[PDB]
Design a protein around this motif. Structure first.
Motif: not given
Lengths: 1265, 40
Positions: A468-477, A485-495, A506-508, A563-566
């Motif tokens: 288990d616990t596969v590695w994606d770089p995306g979900r960590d950032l 609770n930082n909006r301007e970093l999270a809107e970059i992270g979601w893209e 999940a973020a919800s 989804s294996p990421s989450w």
């Protein structure tokens, strides 16, 4: 609180002896009540650490980022009123945005008055929300005119102060718009120049303040700007440029500024005493006339000295073109100074960025450092990326990510992510992490698991961050951006995330759990986290609705999958758990639920046909309702035929027998069979309760028993086989919460109580046991109404009845007060004291309560003597007491009073109370209509999942299927298809193609909303206003535009201070440097260190007479042999065994003093430390004669000088004489502790004599190609 | 007070009145600029 420290640490001066200081408090001005500047004193010398602590930790002033120093003038000057506006605007633009500290001599006289008008003219326009313009000031404590307005040893903290400047003289005044005041005391009240050394030392000290704060040791930039200045002003500029740390920027307006701006166009050798005199004469024209001619030689020589360094000097050039404001010019000149320094290498660009990071400003930095010509690499931006993330600057992160940092390369190692969790600013998540550490990644994951839910699996695992616990770089950032609770970093992270919809939901859920747990910091959790959670809900809905329009048959598979990421949770469950009413009401998900509940048989078939097919079983095999399998087969054949016809001019086949057994498993069938069995239970219970009851049990009552326990067993088995099955009491806590479960919970208990009383077999208990069971039949009938809540027509009807239940009890109480009052009055008036309490209550509460509902002509039942009897105390057989009589058969009380009272009573009862009771319900019913549509859909899911996990047989036989399920369960083999249409696990390539598809759909969506946001009116007005504002200013400037109509002298021996002494050399211009010209006042002082007309300096005049730190006069020789060889065996680079001194840390040459008439072998053995001179003996015939002659240096005088002979001996590729010398290469000479064959180059940024020799060495080697 | 002053100068019904005044100033000025070139 500061008064305890400020009266215990800081001293003063008096009488020179010292004493503990005074004069402490915050100066407030009478004009505008928006300032409160603090005032402190200090002595001539004060502990440097205490000074920096008072500046930094005490007064709450934040960390210094850029130290800018305005200096000069101190009297007055006038600007032509065009440059001043640009100056004031720019000098505040830079300070405001870089958290700078600007220092000045703070006194309302000249230059500081212009800085004060700058701060005042901006401080109204900004509003002073945050980041105040920290302006520190230095002024002596004796020379303030109105000094008595604040002097106290215990201070005066809200001190008031008024402006006065008529008492000018030796005393001076204090300025108006500053913010912070430091005061120096020298003891003499009539002294002006007491503040210089404290300023110079403090700035040069503070330059090294930014060390140990971050990753690299780069010192903070310091700049000195002087607009206009007197004689002393040049000396600070020279001492600064000699310190070699600051750049210095000059402008056009000032007198001395015009002097340097005019000399800056002329060459350095062209400066002469007469030429500088002819220039300075047409500059001041008061002081040019009043020139002291005994110092002007130093002036000309000093300007000739300071124009020798051509890259620490920048000038505004009289506003040529429109190089914006002065903000950039200063900011770019700082970098331009910053490039040429002690470091040679990759480090110039490396150091250069980090300055752009530490400033919030991005444009200047971006342009300069990101020119088209320059190359990059995604490794070498990692430290700037890391500092930009931790410091939480969004736009700079976006710039670095657009220009070549790949997220996959950046998180290659676990250590970086561990360190990145170590810099969270304080939030509720940080407090919970702090509770859990009472940072390795497992402590993160445990807290995340508690936030997300107990069902999902742990995200990270220790020391297995590599795949288990596969590695994606995306979900960590993305997760790191979400939880703080930082909006301007999270809107970059979601893209950046690979899969999208699962991440957004999940973020919800994370944010809504984190909001509903915290509850103490009311503003943050109440506003920001809920706004952000609803925003990511809206993003998820948008992406899914864009996917649903394209091709729905892959959209459902996107909605189901694991989804294996989450953590191997699906997507629908996350939206379901998190109370997202808005996502679950989207049309595609409702169609999914309908297609599931509808079972195997295809949807859009009317219920009447479905029930009639349930009535006669073979009509299904005949075919009266359509099926999904045959419809899909016909549709596929039709699509194939369409493709064949367009060319011209996979799907399962259908079973025949298992058609029926597949029909008998859909939930729409089991709901109807269960409701039929439920009517059957009501029938059976009625016929056992009314007819078949006896003192002994019958077979009908036994069938009743077993069928009830079958219902209880199916409820228990639908508890433990649900999802989230692992663990106890969670589903019990889910089940007991709501009102409709209470009925089953009551009824199953009370039934068993009835069975105990029924079997107890007593005389009187058997009756009560029948009573309880007859009560429970009401409850078993009552829970059918909740079953008829499923339909959409009857769904919102019941909740409106449920809502208004509470008010009726209070209303009934209000009415009951009135009827009890009426009854007690009525029976009290015309009836004597009656001893019968039952007659009191029956004629006091009952008879009025029965009166109010009868008809009004029927209600008047009033005569004296019909049925009441009273001669006796109380005729017992149901006779009330008679009314008291005056005459025979006559009431003493008039009957029409009773009539009138009853009319008023029933008039108040009917119209005034119950119509209010009615009026409540109509308004609420009208009001409640708008929000109903959603909650029903959420409950629609809450139903459907049950029946899909119920055995197929009707509840009379559910006992046998329950036994069969348990006998399957004790078989020790368990591989269920339980929820095999909810949890689905895909194959590999289908998953990869699917995720790439939906990522393409997301990249469609974001462009869709950006194009649809820039078409609204409320944006486009804001655009046109900004363009009009730019076009207006520019026109004014356009109108204004129309409205306006080599190295022949030695330069190291003419240092104005002699090295390592206190004597000063004579000031020697460039024109009279040679021996050909003669200077008439030429009289250099003679100071040999520790026959001076023997020789003459071949370079020229130096202003220094004697033998200055040399054993003999005249030429002092030092030979510099260069021991060179190749770097590699492939002859790709060159190398030389240069030294690197332990004191200077510089890659210097290996050459010592060559004496006059010295043998080269013995001097080589002395300079090299030859323990083996045979390798040099075979190599005595190597190459030599690189250069020979005079060398400029600080030590040169009129008598002694330094000459040199450069030698370069480059061996072959093998260098056989270098093995023995390299083996004996150690810390021999005790000055160069490293000594190796460093790689040579064409470096002209080296030592001054060696740069030309290396440049000639590269001119020899590489010019052949 | 700074909060309401920053929130009053962001409404539409003020910013239209600003752009109208700036357009009215920029129009007159252009005529005068033309006249300045017009004088040789």
């Amino acid at each position: 609180s500061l008064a305890s420290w400020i009266k215990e640490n800081i001293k003063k001066k008096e009488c020179v002896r010292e004493t503990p200081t005074d004069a402490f408090g915050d100066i407030s001005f009478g004009g505008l009540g928006q300032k409160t500047g603090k005032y402190v004193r200090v002595s001539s010398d004060t502990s440097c650490e205490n000074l920096y602590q008072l500046m930094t930790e005490q007064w709450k002033l934040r960390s210094p980022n850029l130290l800018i120093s305005v200096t000069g003038g101190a009297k007055n000057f006038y600007i032509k009123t065009h440059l001043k506006d640009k100056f004031r605007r720019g000098l505040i633009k830079v300070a405001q945005t870089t958290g700078a500290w600007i220092l000045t001599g703070g006194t309302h006289a000249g230059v500081m008055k212009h800085v004060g008008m700058a701060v005042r003219d901006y401080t109204l326009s900004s509003g002073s929300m945050e980041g105040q313009i920290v302006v520190i000031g230095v002024a002596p404590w004796g020379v303030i005119h109105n000094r008595s307005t604040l002097i106290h040893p215990e201070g005066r903290f809200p001190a008031y102060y008024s402006l006065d400047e008529q008492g000018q003289g030796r005393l001076s005044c204090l300025d108006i718009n500053h913010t912070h005041f430091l005061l120096v005391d020298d003891g003499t009240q009539g002294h002006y120049g007491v503040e210089i050394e404290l300023r110079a030392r403090l700035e040069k000290l503070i330059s090294k303040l930014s060390l140990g704060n971050r990753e690299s040791g780069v010192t903070i930039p310091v700049v000195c700007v002087v607009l206009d200045g007197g004689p002393g002003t040049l000396n600070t500029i020279y001492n600064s440029m000699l310190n070699h740390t600051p750049c210095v920027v000059l402008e056009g307006s000032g007198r001395l500024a015009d002097v340097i701006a005019h000399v800056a166009s002329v060459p350095v050798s062209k400066v002469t005493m007469a030429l500088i005199n002819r220039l300075l004469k047409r500059f001041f024209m008061q002081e040019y006339k009043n020139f002291t001619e005994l110092q002007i030689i130093e002036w000309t020589k000093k300007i000739q000295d300071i124009l020798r360094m051509p890259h620490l000097l920048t000038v505004f050039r009289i506003d040529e073109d429109k190089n914006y404001d002065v903000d950039v010019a200063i900011l770019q000149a700082l970098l331009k100074a910053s490039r040429s320094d002690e470091h040679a290498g990759r480090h110039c660009w490396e150091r250069q960025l980090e300055l752009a990071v530490a400033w919030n400003r991005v444009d200047i930095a971006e342009s300069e450092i990101f020119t088209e010509e320059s190359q990059w690499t995604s490794s070498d931006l990692h430290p700037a990326m890391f500092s930009a993330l931790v410091g939480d600057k969004p736009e700079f992160v976006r710039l670095l990510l657009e220009n070549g940092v790949c997220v996959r390369e950046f998180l290659e190692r676990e250590e970086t992510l561990c360190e990145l969790y170590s810099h969270l600013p304080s939030c509720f998540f940080l407090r919970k992490l702090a509770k859990r550490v009472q940072v390795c990644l497992s402590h993160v994951s445990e807290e995340v698991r508690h936030l997300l839910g107990s069902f999902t699996q742990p995200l990270y695992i220790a020391s297995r961050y590599k795949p288990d616990t596969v590695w994606d770089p995306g979900r960590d950032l993305f997760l790191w951006a979400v939880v703080q609770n930082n909006r301007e970093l999270a809107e970059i992270g979601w893209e950046q995330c690979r899969d999208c919809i699962a991440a957004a939901l999940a973020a919800s859920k994370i944010l809504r759990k984190l909001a509903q747990e915290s509850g103490e910091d009311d503003s943050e959790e109440a506003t920001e986290m809920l706004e952000l959670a609803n925003h990511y809900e809206k993003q998820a809905i948008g992406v899914f609705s864009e996917c649903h329009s394209w091709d729905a048959q892959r959209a459902q598979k996107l909605l189901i999958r694991i989804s294996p990421s989450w953590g191997r949770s699906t997507c629908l469950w996350l939206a379901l758990e998190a109370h997202d009413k808005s996502f679950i009401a989207h049309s595609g998900v409702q169609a999914l639920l309908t297609q599931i509940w509808c079972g195997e048989l295809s949807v859009d078939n009317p219920h009447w046909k479905v029930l009639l097919c349930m009535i006669f079983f073979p009509l299904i095999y005949t075919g009266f309702l359509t099926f999904r399998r045959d419809e899909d087969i016909q549709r596929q054949a039709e699509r194939t035929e369409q493709q064949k016809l367009a060319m011209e001019s996979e799907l399962k086949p259908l079973n025949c027998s298992s058609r029926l057994m597949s029909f008998l498993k859909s939930p729409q069938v089991k709901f109807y069979w269960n409701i039929a069995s439920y009517f059957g239970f009501l029938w059976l219970f009625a016929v056992v309760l009314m007819i078949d009851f006896q003192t002994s049990p019958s077979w009908r009552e036994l069938l009743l028993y077993v069928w009830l326990t079958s219902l209880v067993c199916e409820e228990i088995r639908q508890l433990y086989h649900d999802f989230d099955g692992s663990g106890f009491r969670r589903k019990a806590k889910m089940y007991i919460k709501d009102l409709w479960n209470i009925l089953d919970v009551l009824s199953i208990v009370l039934f068993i109580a009835g069975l105990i009383c029924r079997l107890q077999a007593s005389d009187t208990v058997f009756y009560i046991g029948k009573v309880i069971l007859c009560i429970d039949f009401i409850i078993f009938c009552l829970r059918l109404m909740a079953i008829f809540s499923i339909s959409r027509t009857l769904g919102p009807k019941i909740i409106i009845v449920r809502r208004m239940m509470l008010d009726l009890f209070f209303f009934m109480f209000l009415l009951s007060i009135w009827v009890v009052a009426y009854g007690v009055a009525k029976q009290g008036i015309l009836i004597e004291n009656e001893e019968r309490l039952n007659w009191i209550i029956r004629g006091a509460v009952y008879e009025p309560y029965i009166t109010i509902f009868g008809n009004f002509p029927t209600n008047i039942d009033n005569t004296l003597f019909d049925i009441s009897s009273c001669s006796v105390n109380a005729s017992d057989p149901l006779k009330p007491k008679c009314p008291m009589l005056n005459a025979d058969n006559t009431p003493v009380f008039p009957e029409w009073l009773t009539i009138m009272m009853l009319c008023v009573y029933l008039l108040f009862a009917n119209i005034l109370l119950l119509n209010l009771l009615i009026a409540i319900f109509n308004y609420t019913f009208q009001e409640v209509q708008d929000n109903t549509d959603t909650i029903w859909k959420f409950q629609r899911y809450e139903l459907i999942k049950e029946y899909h996990s119920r055995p197929a047989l009707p509840p009379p036989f559910i006992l046998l299927s329950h036994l069969i399920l348990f006998i399957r369960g004790v078989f020790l083999r368990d591989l269920p298809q339980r929820h095999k249409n909810f949890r689905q696990e895909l194959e590999q390539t289908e998953e990869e193609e699917l995720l790439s598809w939906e990522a393409y759909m997301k990249d469609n969506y974001l462009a869709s909303t950006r194009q649809d946001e820039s078409q609204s009116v409320e944006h486009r007005i804001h655009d046109t206003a900004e363009k009009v504002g730019a076009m207006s200013e520019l026109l004014e400037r356009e109108q204004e535009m129309v409205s306006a109509t080599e190295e022949a002298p030695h330069m190291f021996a003419r240092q104005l201070q002699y090295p390592d002494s206190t004597v000063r050399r004579f000031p020697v211009p460039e024109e009279k440097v040679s021996w050909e010209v003669n200077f008439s006042p030429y009289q250099p002082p003679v100071y040999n260190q520790q026959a001076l007309d023997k020789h003459r300096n071949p370079g020229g005049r130096t202003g220094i007479r004697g033998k200055g730190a040399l054993n003999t006069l005249g030429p002092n020789h030092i030979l510099h042999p260069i021991f060179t060889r190749w770097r590699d065996a492939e002859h790709k680079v060159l190398e030389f065994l240069a030294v690197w001194e332990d004191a200077e840390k510089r890659w210097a040459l290996l050459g010592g003093p060559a004496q006059p008439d010295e043998p080269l072998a013995q001097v080589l053995e002395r300079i090299l430390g030859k323990k083996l001179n045979e390798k040099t003996k075979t190599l005595l015939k190597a190459g030599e004669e690189v250069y020979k002659g005079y060398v400029d240096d600080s030590r040169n005088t009129d008598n002694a000088w330094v000459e040199t002979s450069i030698i370069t001996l480059h061996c072959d590729k093998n260098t056989p004489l270098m093995a023995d010398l390299n083996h004996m290469v150690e810390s021999s000479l005790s000055s160069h502790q490293p000594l190796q064959w460093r790689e040579v180059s064409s470096d002209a940024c080296r030592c001054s004599y060696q740069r030309e020799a290396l440049r000639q060495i590269a001119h020899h080697h590489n010019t052949y190609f």
